[PDB]
Amino acid sequence: LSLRPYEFWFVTGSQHLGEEALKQVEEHSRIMVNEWNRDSVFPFPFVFKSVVTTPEEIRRVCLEANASEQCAGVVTWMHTFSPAKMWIGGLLELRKPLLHLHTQFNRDIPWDSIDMDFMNLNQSAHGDREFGFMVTRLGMPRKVIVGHWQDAEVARRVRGWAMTAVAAAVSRGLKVARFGDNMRQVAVTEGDKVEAEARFGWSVNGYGVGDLAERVRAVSEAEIDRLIDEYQSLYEFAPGCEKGGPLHDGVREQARIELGLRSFLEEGGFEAFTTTFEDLHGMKQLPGLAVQRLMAEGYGFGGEGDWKTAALVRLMKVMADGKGTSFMEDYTYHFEPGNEMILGAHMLEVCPTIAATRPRIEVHPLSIGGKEDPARLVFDGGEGAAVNASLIDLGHRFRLIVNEVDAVKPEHDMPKLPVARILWKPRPSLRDSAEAWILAGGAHHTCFSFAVTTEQLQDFAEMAGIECVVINEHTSVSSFKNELKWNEVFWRGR
Amino acid sequence: LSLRPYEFWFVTGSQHLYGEEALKQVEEHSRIMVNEWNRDSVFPFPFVFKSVVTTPEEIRRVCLEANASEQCAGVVTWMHTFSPAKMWIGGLLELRKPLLHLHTQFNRDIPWDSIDMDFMNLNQSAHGDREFGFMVTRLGMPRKVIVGHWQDAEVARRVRGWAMTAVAAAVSRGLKVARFGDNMRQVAVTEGDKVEAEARFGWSVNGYGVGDLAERVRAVSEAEIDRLIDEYQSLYEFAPGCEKGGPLHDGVREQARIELGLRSFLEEGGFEAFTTTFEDLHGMKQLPGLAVQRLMAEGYGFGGEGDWKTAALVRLMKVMADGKGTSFMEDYTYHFEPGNEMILGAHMLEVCPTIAATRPRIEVHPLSIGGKEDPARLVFDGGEGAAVNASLIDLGHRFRLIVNEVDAVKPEHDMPKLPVARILWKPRPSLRDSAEAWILAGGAHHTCFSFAVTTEQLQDFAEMAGIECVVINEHTSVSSFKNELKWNEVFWRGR
Amino acid sequence: LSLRPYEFWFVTGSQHLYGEEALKQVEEHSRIMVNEWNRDSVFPFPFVFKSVVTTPEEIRRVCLEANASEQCAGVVTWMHTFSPAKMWIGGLLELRKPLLHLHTQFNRDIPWDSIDMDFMNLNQSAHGDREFGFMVTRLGMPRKVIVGHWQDAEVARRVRGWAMTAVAAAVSRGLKVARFGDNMRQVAVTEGDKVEAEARFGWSVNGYGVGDLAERVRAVSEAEIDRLIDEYQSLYEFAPGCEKGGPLHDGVREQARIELGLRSFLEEGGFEAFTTTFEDLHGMKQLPGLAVQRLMAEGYGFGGEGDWKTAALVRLMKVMADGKGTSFMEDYTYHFEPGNEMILGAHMLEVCPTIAATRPRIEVHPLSIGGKEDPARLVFDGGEGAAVNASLIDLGHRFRLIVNEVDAVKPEHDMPKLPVARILWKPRPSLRDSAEAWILAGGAHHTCFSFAVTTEQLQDFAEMAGIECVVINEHTSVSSFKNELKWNEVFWRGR
Numbered sequence A: 001l002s003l004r005p006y007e008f009w010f011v012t013g014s015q016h017l018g019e020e021a022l023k024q025v026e027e028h029s030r031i032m033v034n035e036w037n038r039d040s041v042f043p044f045p046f047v048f049k050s051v052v053t054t055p056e057e058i059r060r061v062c063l064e065a066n067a068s069e070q071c072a073g074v075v076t077w078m079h080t081f082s083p084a085k086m087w088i089g090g091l092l093e094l095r096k097p098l099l100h101l102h103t104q105f106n107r108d109i110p111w112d113s114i115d116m117d118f119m120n121l122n123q124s125a126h127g128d129r130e131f132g133f134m135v136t137r138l139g140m141p142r143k144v145i146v147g148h149w150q151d152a153e154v155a156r157r158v159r160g161w162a163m164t165a166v167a168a169a170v171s172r173g174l175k176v177a178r179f180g181d182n183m184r185q186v187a188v189t190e191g192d193k194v195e196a197e198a199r200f201g202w203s204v205n206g207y208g209v210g211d212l213a214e215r216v217r218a219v220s221e222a223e224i225d226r227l228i229d230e231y232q233s234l235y236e237f238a239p240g241c242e243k244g245g246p247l248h249d250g251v252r253e254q255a256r257i258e259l260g261l262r263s264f265l266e267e268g269g270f271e272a273f274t275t276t277f278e279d280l281h282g283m284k285q286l287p288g289l290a291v292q293r294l295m296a297e298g299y300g301f302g303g304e305g306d307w308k309t310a311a312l313v314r315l316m317k318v319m320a321d322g323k324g325t326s327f328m329e330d331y332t333y334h335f336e337p338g339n340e341m342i343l344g345a346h347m348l349e350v351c352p353t354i355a356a357t358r359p360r361i362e363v364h365p366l367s368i369g370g371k372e373d374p375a376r377l378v379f380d381g382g383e384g385a386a387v388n389a390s391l392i393d394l395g396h397r398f399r400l401i402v403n404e405v406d407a408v409k410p411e412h413d414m415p416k417l418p419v420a421r422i423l424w425k426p427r428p429s430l431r432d433s434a435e436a437w438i439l440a441g442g443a444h445h446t447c448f449s450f451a452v453t454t455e456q457l458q459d460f461a462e463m464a465g466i467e468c469v470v471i472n473e474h475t476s477v478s479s480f481k482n483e484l485k486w487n488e489v490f491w492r493g494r
Numbered sequence B, C: 001l002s003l004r005p006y007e008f009w010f011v012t013g014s015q016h017l018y019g020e021e022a023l024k025q026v027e028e029h030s031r032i033m034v035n036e037w038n039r040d041s042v043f044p045f046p047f048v049f050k051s052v053v054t055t056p057e058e059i060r061r062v063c064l065e066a067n068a069s070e071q072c073a074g075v076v077t078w079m080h081t082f083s084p085a086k087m088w089i090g091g092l093l094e095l096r097k098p099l100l101h102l103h104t105q106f107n108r109d110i111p112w113d114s115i116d117m118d119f120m121n122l123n124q125s126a127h128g129d130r131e132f133g134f135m136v137t138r139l140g141m142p143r144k145v146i147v148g149h150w151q152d153a154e155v156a157r158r159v160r161g162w163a164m165t166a167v168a169a170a171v172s173r174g175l176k177v178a179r180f181g182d183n184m185r186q187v188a189v190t191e192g193d194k195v196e197a198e199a200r201f202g203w204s205v206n207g208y209g210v211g212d213l214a215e216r217v218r219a220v221s222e223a224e225i226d227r228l229i230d231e232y233q234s235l236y237e238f239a240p241g242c243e244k245g246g247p248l249h250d251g252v253r254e255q256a257r258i259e260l261g262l263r264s265f266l267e268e269g270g271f272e273a274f275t276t277t278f279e280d281l282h283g284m285k286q287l288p289g290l291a292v293q294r295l296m297a298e299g300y301g302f303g304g305e306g307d308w309k310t311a312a313l314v315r316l317m318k319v320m321a322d323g324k325g326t327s328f329m330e331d332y333t334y335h336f337e338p339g340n341e342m343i344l345g346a347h348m349l350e351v352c353p354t355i356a357a358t359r360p361r362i363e364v365h366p367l368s369i370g371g372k373e374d375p376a377r378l379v380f381d382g383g384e385g386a387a388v389n390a391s392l393i394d395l396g397h398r399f400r401l402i403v404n405e406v407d408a409v410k411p412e413h414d415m416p417k418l419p420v421a422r423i424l425w426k427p428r429p430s431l432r433d434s435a436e437a438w439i440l441a442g443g444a445h446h447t448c449f450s451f452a453v454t455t456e457q458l459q460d461f462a463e464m465a466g467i468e469c470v471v472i473n474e475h476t477s478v479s480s481f482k483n484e485l486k487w488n489e490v491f492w493r494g495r
């Protein structure tokens, strides 16, 4: 699932206090931007925009940055002193993520060269502080990275942020197609699409399942054959799911459902969607392998109408570069002292991008939805550092909840388990993470990711103006409880 | 649509200072009072007297009982004597039922002749009801306060007004709403938080696939269509081509189908309101039209394009109105004729016949919207008189109830080309100002219009549900209204 | 001082999506769990299985029953399966009983061989509980959350600790406090708002003149004194002068007289806590002393000088402590010996013998304070080990519970000229920092000292009551703590 050619504008501040210094500032910036496009750490193209010098110049490049659908964020560096009142109109206008790069062109103080002319020119030490003030003063969410522009860690911090900014750009235009209403009587998948569209840009809208049913009925048995070809190209088949076997019908249906979905979603420029098993009129099966393959392509998905998680999965997939990110649900607990684990799955819908094992197409009965035995990819999830993120609506506001977890390889086979699954050990413990999660009103539905950092989901939440609360090795429940209370008083009316 | 046999618990507060005999005389007064009110037997909901409360345990048990009692629509509290109000804290903190504080007195007049420390000791409501007043205000509880002698008629009118609001509230707490399809796509004001709504009003709002209604209408007996088309004929004129064997009696048949499949679903689930969306009618011959208007008539809430907020409100307001003169309504177009400025309200089809001046007429007309077969609908002219046009919207953090007082006017000219039931109103204070105030209140295009709900009832409901009620009437000026929106915003946030 | 036969309601949530037999599996899992938890007299409060709740009406019924039940001290909810939480909103909104969300699972371990969707459909708590977790948070209602397998020992300890908090909470709800006299004049911290206290904690705090007490103390017969003296002899050492036919014994007997009058008065009114004031002892021979220590040992709350908050807090903490290691206490003087900094805790007379390490000794000594006759009191050395020192103060707009974690220490040195029961502790983290943190928090000089009540139980009680709980322990930094106070203040305002 293709991105738009997303670029970050490097904006360098000065004022007027000569043209010769202004051109030294300019080449410094261009050099920095040119060597960033050639450092393999920096994930999207940086564009030198201007040395900005005047209010009208600051405001123009900020207006330009809003209108530029390809501008994902703006990186500001005050090379010289840049009297920050000049910046007010621009910053008031800026609505693209902001990195304040607090840097210096030169790394070391030239101890014998150090003169008033050098100092007059390389002023960021204070020029970035005066800008710091102005951005803090207007209450604006921004990223602040301090270091020499060549620094390896600066590089790593800047790209982590850049992935987040790209996730936010996709967020601004993000169209979510829901095929059915929320699973009846369910609270946490409910919330305010208007707030969500105001807060995150998400477009979330209902299509009757009729409208998907209609477009699955319109797929050629020919085009199903092309896709089965490419299923044989990718996936193991369970005895009876390969060509001719008694269950391959089921696989064909999911290939049908898959291609009807891709058609609907590609037509409407949707990057995420939800289904609801409670409403499967005109569908042979609850979508499963179809969804699993669409998530792998880079599509957000949420079960039982869960547009928040659907959107969250697309965004985190954008943050992760497509890798090791799935829709996820906490299905059961392994409480063994010393080996406490959560088994994470869904009815069918786990993205193969988290798979440790080569995915296998299987067909098994699924009571839930009263439809035909769904085909689905079955795998063991990978191992290592991951985040389990839920975005809930508290009514007045959204709260992003991120749990740091360690996914573990199953030691034991689960041969009667018909769904792809992942085992994780939540930090700081099952007992404590689950408790902090529940107190935070974390959903059952999460986006799980091996490739999104805590810092990225925090930066995303900063960009969107929502609370993000993190459960990890350092979380204690008493301290967490208090952080919820204090965040609440900060975040109400914001 | 039957109400539960809702009742109203009279609770009379006293202490022990005065004795057991005073407490019997207090019980007697209270029973005479409840008994007179019930004899005047026209009012649909009885007052059930609940023995005199004198202890925190007594106060607390009745308030727990009242909470459990599905019949209990509200509690009417009266301090006959000083009933020291700290006693009431346990009860008041338990009470989740609409409270009326009836600030009354058994005798009307100071019996100047005989008035002695015995009478002053027994007829203490003057201070008793104030002591209780402080306590209810201190706990930040919403209550109605009706002051006057219990036999006063304005007391009767205010209490009955409130009781109808209390019963509407009670319907609200259990209110189940079926949604056939999602909101009309890209629409804002019909969108909202169903969890906030359930928490705040008790409405259960859950979506059923349109297929779930289509399956139910496919099952509707070609025969039972026939038995209903018989009821149609009995009630409603048929437009030429729509009656008996005419080339559009199918349209009417297909609405009787939908009417019976809708009612099957809604009766099965105990649903007292529903929503349809023209954007999702897979398995339907027509957008429910005649079907929906009939269902509104017998008391169902309805909202179009998945508008559950208005569906619930149409339901609540229909219950407040005693089933009468209450409809789902949309502002469709304006008459801007200076001195004759009016709003024409309709919907594509779904206008309740309970607001009809002219006997409704089954007609079938094309409807582009939805790309389905020519829907049958009842067409009629709305009544006239004082009415309320009420929107309930989701500001994101809380709900706002917006009531515009309007005057529905008998139409001067015919709208013979207009295939939908319709109504004209002049909104107070003016079209210019109401519509401006309405827009600044962010009022929906979807409303419940009612000839029978008072402003005071919708305020009373808002107070009961702890939501802002903004009212646009003859006294509204936009400068003030704006300020009141700003000051209300600061009071209502996180409540 | 007997408790109601309090019980905890285990409520299991499911629905219908897996069938009526999957519901029987759930019901049988929960019955096992409840039976297993009741099995031994492990605990004075049983768990009661409440049939699985699967509908809004079921969930509302059990929460309404829970509230109405005087025996039900708390509800323990567990989502065995997905139990869509909109169903729970109506229920949760009614529940004014301590909620513990037990996030558990019937099986400890994933049965790796057999785990199939029959199993993943039934043991879904991993998500069931989170969906419920969201609803409870969303309603912002206070709850304990305990994760862990139901047979896990840590789970049992926590559930037992919370259970004791909830019973204390239940006692708080009907807690009746008698004040014999008003606040000590000009004292601030013992002052507060009895109305806010009733609303937030459930305490009925009311003033008797001491005449009421003296009167009842006078009506005590010389024979009831004689029988209680005989009980004193069996329990306590009499100091030389204090035994029958000693010159001081009359002082003891007058304490015996006060103990009997007080007990009569307190039992008559169902009072479980009381206050005296040395400033108002008209009709009394002595400041109540031995009598008060005795009444505290029986489980009564006491606060001196009209301190009803502490009195109530002492009753609550005694219930939490299961009547053990819990007294009214005051900070009397400081040992500032560097390396050996400790607080000497006492009161004029009123220290509960339940914190006694040594056999309490009836002593008669002069007491200037109140200008009455040489009161008899139990004198003893407080126990040693981990303890909490709790002040509940009124900040004006809300209560604040302050808990200092201390280490009671055996006195190295005799204090043979100190006529009062006393205890030493080392306040955590240091005398320097605890006293500073305590002063910044406005901690009272009057505390409930307890060997048995844990920081988490009081924190749990605070959660329950919706008041700030501030804890000073080994982890406390005075800089961090002043910020926690500012931030707490902002949250707790208007709540």
Ligand SMILES: [Mn+2]
Pocket (backbone or CB within 6 Å): A303, A304, A329, A346, A445
């Ligand atoms: Mn799910």
Ligand SMILES: [Mn+2]
Pocket (backbone or CB within 6 Å): A192, A195, A394, A395, A396, A397, B193, B196, B396, B397, B398
């Ligand atoms: Mn909301």
Ligand SMILES: [Mn+2]
Pocket (backbone or CB within 6 Å): B304, B305, B330, B347, B446
């Ligand atoms: Mn409409």
Ligand SMILES: [Mn+2]
Pocket (backbone or CB within 6 Å): C304, C305, C330, C347, C446
């Ligand atoms: Mn004292």
